[PDB]
Amino acid sequence: GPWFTDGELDIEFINSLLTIVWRFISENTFPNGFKNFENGPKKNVFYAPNVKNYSTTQEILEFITAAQVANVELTPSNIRSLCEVLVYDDKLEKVTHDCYRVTLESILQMNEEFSIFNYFKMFPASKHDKEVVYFDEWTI
Amino acid sequence: SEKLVTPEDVMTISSLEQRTLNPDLFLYKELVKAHLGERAASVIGMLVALGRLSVRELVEKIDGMDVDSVKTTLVSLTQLRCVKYLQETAISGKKTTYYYYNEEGIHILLYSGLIIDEIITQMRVNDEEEHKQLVAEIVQNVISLGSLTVEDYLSSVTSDSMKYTISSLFVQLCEMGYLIQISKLHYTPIEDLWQFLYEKHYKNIPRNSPLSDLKKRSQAKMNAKTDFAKIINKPNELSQILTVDPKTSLRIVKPTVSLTINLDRFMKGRRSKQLINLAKTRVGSVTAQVYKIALRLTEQKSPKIRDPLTQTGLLQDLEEAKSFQDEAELVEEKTPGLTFNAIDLARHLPAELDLRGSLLSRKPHSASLINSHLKILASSNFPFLNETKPGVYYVPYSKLMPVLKSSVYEYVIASTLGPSAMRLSRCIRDNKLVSEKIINSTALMKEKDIRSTLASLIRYNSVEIQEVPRTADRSASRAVFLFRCKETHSYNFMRQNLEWNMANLLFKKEKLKQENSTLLKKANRDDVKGRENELLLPSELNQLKMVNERELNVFARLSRLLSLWEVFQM
Amino acid sequence: TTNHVLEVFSVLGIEAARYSIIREINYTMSNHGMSVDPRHIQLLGDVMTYKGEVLGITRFGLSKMRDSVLQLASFEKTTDHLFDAAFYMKKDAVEGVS
Amino acid sequence: IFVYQNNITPSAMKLVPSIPPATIETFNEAALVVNITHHELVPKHIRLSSDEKRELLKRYRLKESQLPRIQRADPVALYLGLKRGEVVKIIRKSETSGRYASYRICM
Amino acid sequence: NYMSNLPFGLGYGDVGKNHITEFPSIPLPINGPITNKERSLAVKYINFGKTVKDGPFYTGSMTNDGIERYSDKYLKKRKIGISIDDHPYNLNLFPNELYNVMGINKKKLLAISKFNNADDVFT
RNA sequence: GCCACAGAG
DNA sequence: ATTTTTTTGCCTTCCGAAAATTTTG
DNA sequence: CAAAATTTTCGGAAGGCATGCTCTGTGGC
Ligand SMILES: CCC[C@@H](C)[C@H]1CC[C@H]2[C@@H]3[C@H](O)C[C@@H]4C[C@H](O)CC[C@]4(C)[C@H]3C[C@H](O)[C@]12C
């Protein structure tokens, strides 16, 4: 693939390409896109279950060919592999072979009661606090 | 601490002495010592450490406590349902009572305020202050006294209308499953009960049967299984509420029955809350409200968190394991009170909920929109709902709880060790056994990042190294190391880690209260309460404020751990 | 009869094994004219045959006859005995001479 | 008392403690051709009752774990059918003194 | 020499120290600020613990001078404590060997603590 | 200091 | 990068392999 | 009845110990 730069990976190229593919899929899988989530949590809307909100591999390949930001030709295996990297990050999900759809958690990650899933909304504890809980403790 | 830290400081400011304790023993002893006294803590600790013990063995194993003190603290523990017992007679005719420890009472002590808040929330009495306060006080009295009778509770109330409202609230608690009838079932162990039933139904089969030994064992265990199910399902049949119309034709629970808190129903509610929180991150917010209404409607008749037959040691047969799986899958679906439709959910939606514009079809509590929400719930990647027939839905717990466990565990890893750790863990879990090169090819990030991240993941049993030796002696240089992800080891280790964290937090809080005991005793007086700013020094006031804030933060962090620990109890 | 002692122990019991030990040791001493008083031989036989079986005067016999740790460690296989005592957490009452 | 002829399977040796109040003793016909208690090497074993055992323990002022032990499955113990905790008095004949009494406890 | 060869990634100036920290550095996200619902939940914990601690079932830890003065008269008694054997036990829930430490045929009163909606915790 | 042999009764 | 040994006996524990026995179909 | 699981028996190898108890010298690393 084109990711091999001087014998190793080029992580900046990976991040930019994954961001633009996730951007495209999120535009397709939602009615109005991120602006639909921009105004507030309650005014947002979602597609009906019969709507084909999933994005296939060919549409993604055509979009990344038209964008010409990679500057290198892309095989469908390569775009499939990087979308597999995306679903490994739990940014999107696969509902059918060669079919993907952005999850809502990755949408909320960009921008009440405690839950583990919205951990980014939680603030770090103040210093000089004795009763603070560490995951690394009991095994250090 | 950039400078050198002496072992004095390591021992006195860190938790090194608490890292050598078993998390179960540490948590149970800390909870019992916090709520009950030190003698009960010693008894519970010895019961956890040595297993089952008689009263004589508890006397001879604990120094400084005689038979009267042991019996008194055993009575105190038994009233709060913290100790199970079994009275057995040997062949020689001697009768011995062996006392166990049961996690039910300790979890009741651990979940107490969460239980009270759940009772307050789940019967929509938040609008009415009198009903809310009465429900809170009766639940607190039930938990603090372990089990109580309605007649004894009402003997302390003099107003007739107040007595009627208390009886009505007790009936309302009983009908929705939160208060049940206590019995010797809740004090007898599950393993001993199944052993007794199996032995009885094995000796019931007469001699000289034509059928073989395996068939005899299977028949005896099937009869014991149905008898065990009938025995366990006894307190859920509302036999203690059947006393109707003594006068003026109202339904009241009997004044000669002992009611107690039901932990299984509370854990069902906690499971429903966890599933709601999981669904909030996949399918919308209005869809989450519909899922919440559907789960709260079918919460009481949902299957139990842990099937007790799995705790009888019967899982040593593969056929029994798959039979348990099949029975759970059948009972999650064909229970009459579990299936629901859009019309059933339409009668329980709140007035503020609209559903009108939440759906866009193409690129007033209507049944079609509710059905669309249930469809997008059932069509999501996570199996939130399954459709036996078009238009009817049920919650597939046996196929949803592993997904909830995996998601919670993965997001704990993502929040602690970083998102790259979550990516590596999911890459290893996707394709089961992989090498480093295959990881680098499938997961596009740097090889040294792969190695450091998996080395970090190894320490918490997240990733297990499979060594493939290529020589006669398994040298590390000549061998090749693959990586696999084992779910059970990781879940067990994370459960133990969170349990130890809860125990350490409780220990820290107890130490702080013990070292500020003088100020806390001065402040916790009837006259001083409500007049703290006048009868106390400003330094004492600041110390009291700091101590109370620290205690509040401790209990909030304990609640947040409990929201993160019960998932691995499922 | 048999000069072999464990054979007599298996056939006739421990109490005949004790006579076999005493008689065989006495015969061996008397052939060379050493003239030892047989009360010492009786004591040796009783020590070999007081735990219900013929143990034998060896490190495996002492591992079963003596429950002390320091006595067995000072005799033979010190490391194994000390590590076994540490692992099994046995309590050594200081009553022995060693 | 069960007397088999050639051999007994190991699966039946673990089935003998099946009855709680009763006990089963298995013997071999080859092992019963000659009596072992009539051998000149084997002295006189006499099992003691509970009262006699208590009297012995009171006379020597000791707990039952401090007595010399005799195993079960020992040939003489199998012959007399000693159970666990029973004390047998043994009449030894030594040429030095004459007849003297020793005691053993079944274990 | 056993102290010469190094792995390819490492360098000579990076090894030889072995300073493994004893204090953890990976916190869980539960350490955020408290909220109103969490504060009510925490004071519910505190009130329940106070109720159990002062209840009849405590079994505590394992200047009353002998001299008598006139000031001993007109002195209030501390508090008439409810003991272990002053509770209406359901005898079917207990083993028979624990009966003699309970009150089989003595005075029984059921101590009831009323829930306090107001927050007793001072800030 | 560690090994190595050499002797004495 | 061809290639000696340099006492003799006794003892327990382990660990596949094969045999013996029971247990499922 | 014979296929499959469980248990026992039987070897060869792998470990370990012993190969006195004290005492007096030298020679080389
Ligand atoms: C080819 C030589 C085999 C030989 C070394 C085997 C075969 C016969 C075996 C003896 C018999 O089993 C009878 C006795 C059984 C006791 O338990 C231990 C001692 C005992 C005398 C045995 C010792 C040893 O085991 C023998 C002699």
Beta bridge partners of C51: D69
- Which helix (H) or strand (E) covers residue B110, if one does? helix B103-110
E119 CB neighbour count, 10 Å cutoff: 15
d(CA C33, CA B526): 99
Q: What separation in angstroms does the CA of B213 have from each of B194, B205, B312?
A: 19, 11, 21
CB contact under 8 A, A11 and B445: yes
What's the angle, vertex CA B559, arms to CA B554 and CA B561, rounded to 5?
Answer: 95
Q: Is the dihedral of CA B147, B152, B155, B161 positive or negative?
A: positive
Strand runs (DSSP E) across chain A, as ranges?
4-5, 8-9, 46-47, 55-56, 92-96, 99-102
- Residue B310's nearest CA partner among B322, B292, B298, B302 is B322
- What residue of B is the nearest CA neighbor of E108? B152
How is chain E split among helix, strand and coil, in percent rounded to 5?
A: 25, 0, 75
Look up residue B330 and give its two tokens. Answer: 């059948």
Length B335 CA → G25 C1' (Å)? 36
Beta bridge partners of D87: D105
Pick from A44, A119, A130: CB nearest B508? A130
CB contact under 8 A, E43 and B556: no
List CB contacts (< 8 A) between E19 and chain A.
none
- Residue B356's nearest CA partner among B343, B336, B335, B370 is B370
CB contact under 8 A, E30 and A136: no
Would you call B250 helix, strand, or coil by DSSP?
coil
Length C4 CA → G7 C1' (Å)? 28
DSSP secondary-structure letter at B233? Answer: T
User: What is the distance of C-alpha B77 from the center of its chain?
Assistant: 20
d(CA B180, CA B174): 6
List CB contacts (< 8 A) between B143 and chain E.
48
Q: Find where tokens 């105004």 sit.
A: A39
d(CA C3, CA D41): 12
Chains E and B contact (Cβ–Cβ under 8 Å for 3 or more pairs): yes
Q: Find where tokens 């009572």 sit.
A: B97
Residue with CA nearest ligand 1 atom 20: C7
Residue with CA nearest ligand 1 atom 22: C7
Residue A1: which residues within 8 A CB-CB, separation 6 or more?
A75, A78, A81
- Residue E31's nearest CA partner among B482, B286, B104, B561 is B561
Task: State how far residue A137 is from chain E, nearest Cα, in angstroms.
Answer: 6
Q: Is the dihedral of CA A92, A93, A95, A97 positive or negative?
A: positive
d(CA B399, CA C77): 57
Residue with CA nearest ligand 1 atom 21: C7
- Domain holding D107, by residue range, is 35-107
| Residues making up chain A, counted from first to last | 140
Pick from D76, D96, D107: CB nearest C13? D76
Q: Are B389 and B373 in contact (CB under 8 A)?
A: no
- Residue B179's nearest CA partner among B254, B244, B230, B124 is B254
| Three-state secondary structure of A106-128 | HHHHHCCCCCCCCHHHCCCCCCC
Q: Does the beta carbon of E32 lie under 8 angstroms from any beta carbon of chain A? A: yes
Give the number of beta-carbon pairs within 8 Å between B and E. Answer: 176
Q: Are C27 and C33 in contact (CB under 8 A)?
A: no
Q: Are E75 and E92 in contact (CB under 8 A)?
A: no
Beta bridge partners of D102: D90
Q: Find where tokens 């979890």 sit.
A: B107
Chains C and A contact (Cβ–Cβ under 8 Å for 3 or more pairs): no
CB contact under 8 A, E21 and A122: no
For ligand 1, the distance from its centroid to the CA atom of residue D25, given in whole angstroms, is 25
Method for this entry: cryo-EM
Which residue type, as a one-letter code, is found at position D48? L
Q: Is the dihedral of CA B308, B310, B312, B314 positive or negative?
A: positive
Q: Which atom of ligand 1 is nearest to the CA of C10?
A: 16
- Residue B216's nearest CA partner among B235, B199, B195 is B199
What's the angle, vertex CA A110, arms to CA A107 and CA A114, rounded to 5?
Answer: 85
- Residue D84's nearest CA partner among D98, D65, D100 is D65
Q: Is the dihedral of CA B489, B495, B499, B501 positive or negative?
A: positive
DSSP string, A58-90: HHHHHHHHHH--S-S---HHHHHHHHHHHHHTT
Q: Are D103 and D55 in contact (CB under 8 A)?
A: no
- Residue B240's nearest CA partner among B151, B310, B165, B118 is B151
Residue C27: which residues within 8 A CB-CB, separation 6 or more?
none
User: What is the distance of C-alpha B366 from the center of its chain?
Assistant: 37
Q: What separation in angstroms does the CA of C16 have from each of B143, B537, C51, D76?
A: 69, 89, 14, 10
Q: Which atom of ligand 1 is nearest to the CA of C6?
A: 19
Q: What separation in angstroms does the CA of B429 have from each of B70, B139, B402, B434, B549?
A: 51, 44, 14, 9, 42
Pick from A46, A132, A135: CB nearest B359? A46
What's the angle, vertex CA C30, arms to CA C27 and CA C31, rounded to 5?
Answer: 85
- Residue B110's nearest CA partner among A2, E49, E38 is E49
In units of Å, what resolution does this entry have?
Answer: 2.8
B 521-560 residues inside an 8 A Cβ radius of A:
550, 553-554, 557, 560
d(CA B146, CA B158): 23
Q: In this structure, is the CB of residue C74 within 7 Å of any atom belonging to strand H?
A: no
List the helix and strand counts (H, then E) for chain E.
Answer: 1, 0
Pick from B65, B136, B187: CB nearest E93? B187
Q: In this structure, is the CB of residue C77 within 7 Å of any atom belonging to strand H?
A: yes
d(CA B509, CA B549): 11
- What residue of E is the nearest CA neighbor of A118? E29
B319 CB neighbour count, 10 Å cutoff: 8
Q: Which of residues 1-40 of D touch strand G (CB under 7 A)?
A: 7, 9-12
Beta bridge partners of B95: B89
- What backbone phi and psi angles, to 5 degrees, belong to B85? -140, 155
- Which among C2, C7, C8 is the best mutation to test ligand 1's pocket, defined by most ligand atoms within 8 Å of the CB? C7
d(CA B361, CA A48): 5
CATH code at position D95 = 3.90.940.20
Which residue type, as a one-letter code, is found at position B236? N
Q: Kind of pairing, strands A46-47 and B359-360?
A: parallel
User: What is the distance of C-alpha B459 from the center of its chain?
Assistant: 26
For ligand 1, the distance from its centroid to the CA atom of residue C4, given in whole angstroms, is 11
Give the side-chain half-sphere CA count within 13 A for B331. Answer: 12
- Residue B332's nearest CA partner among B266, B265, B399, B379 is B399
- Which helix (H) or strand (E) covers residue D93, if one does? strand D87-94
Would you call D90 helix, strand, or coil by DSSP?
strand
Residue C6 beta carbon below 6 angstroms from any ligand 1 atom: yes
List CB contacts (< 8 A) between C42 and chain D.
94, 96
Q: Does the beta carbon of E30 lie under 8 angstroms from any beta carbon of chain A? A: yes
Residue C36 beta carbon below 6 angstroms from any ligand 1 atom: no
Give the helix ranges, DSSP H, for D1-107. Answer: 10-13, 50-60, 75-80
For ligand 1, the distance from its centroid to the CA atom of residue C10, given in whole angstroms, is 10
Q: Find where tokens 């055993």 sit.
A: B74
Nucleotides of H under 7 A from a protein CB: 7-9, 16-18
Chain breaks in chain E (C to N over 2.5 A) after: 62
- Interface probe for E, chosen from B70, B121, B145, B149 (most Cβ of E below 10 Å), is B145
CB contact under 8 A, B422 and A89: yes
Q: Nearest nt to D14, CA vs C1'? A: H7
Q: Nearest nt to D9, CA vs C1'? A: G21
List CB contacts (< 8 A) between E25 and chain A.
134, 136
- Helix C5-12 to helix C14-31 angle, to the nearest 10 degrees? 150
Give the number of beta-carbon pairs within 8 Å between C and D. Answer: 52
Task: State how far residue B356 is from chain E, nearest Cα, in angstroms.
Answer: 31
Chains B and A contact (Cβ–Cβ under 8 Å for 3 or more pairs): yes
Look up residue B170 and give its two tokens. Answer: 């007790």
